[PDB]
């Protein structure tokens, strides 16, 4: 679980919006894996407007910190689960790091702010969602 708050907007893994998120709903994409919905408080996150492709993110299923590099955001193809069919996401970034269900929402950041989320993963890898080309959550 987890989310990215910038201004009056929420930002979630699509797969895991609640309720209250849809019925607060700005946009969504189910290529990308991602939902924003709006706030009444303001945010307490800055967001990256860079290449960068190294940081840091928070894996919840060792409750730490690693480091990591990632490649470009690109179409991926991910397999099946209850959430989707089999199909490519787009805007992804994988890098090697340890990754399972449950850390879905874990925050990306390199030196100038939140790059991503974690939206996929498997056998040492770690998917995330990136967030850097959304200009308007500004
Ligand atoms: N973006 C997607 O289509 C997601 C939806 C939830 C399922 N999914 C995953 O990759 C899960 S099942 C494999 C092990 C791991 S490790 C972190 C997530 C996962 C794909
Ligand atoms: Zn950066």
Redesign the pocket.
Do not use: K, W
């Given at each position: 679980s987890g989310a990215i708050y910038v201004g009056n907007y929420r930002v979630v893994?699509?797969?895991l919006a609640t309720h209250n998120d849809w019925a607060n709903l700005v946009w969504e994409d189910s290529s990308r894996?991602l939902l924003v919905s709006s706030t009444t408080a303001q945010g307490c996150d800055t967001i990256a407007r860079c290449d960068c492709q190294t940081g840091v993110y928070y894996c919840s299923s060792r409750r730490k910190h690693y480091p990591v590099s990632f490649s470009k955001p690109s179409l991926i193809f991910?397999?099946a689960?209850?959430?989707?069919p089999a199909?490519y996401?787009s805007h992804?970034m994988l890098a090697v790091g340890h990754?399972?269900?449950?850390?879905?929402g874990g925050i990306l950041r390199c030196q100038h702010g939140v790059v991503g989320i974690?939206?996929?993963?498997?056998?040492g890898?770690?998917?995330f969602?990136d967030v850097r080309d959304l200009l308007w959550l500004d």
């Open positions: 893994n699509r797969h894996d991910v397999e689960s209850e959430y989707y199909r996401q992804l990754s399972e269900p449950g850390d879905c974690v939206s996929t993963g498997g056998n890898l770690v998917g969602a």
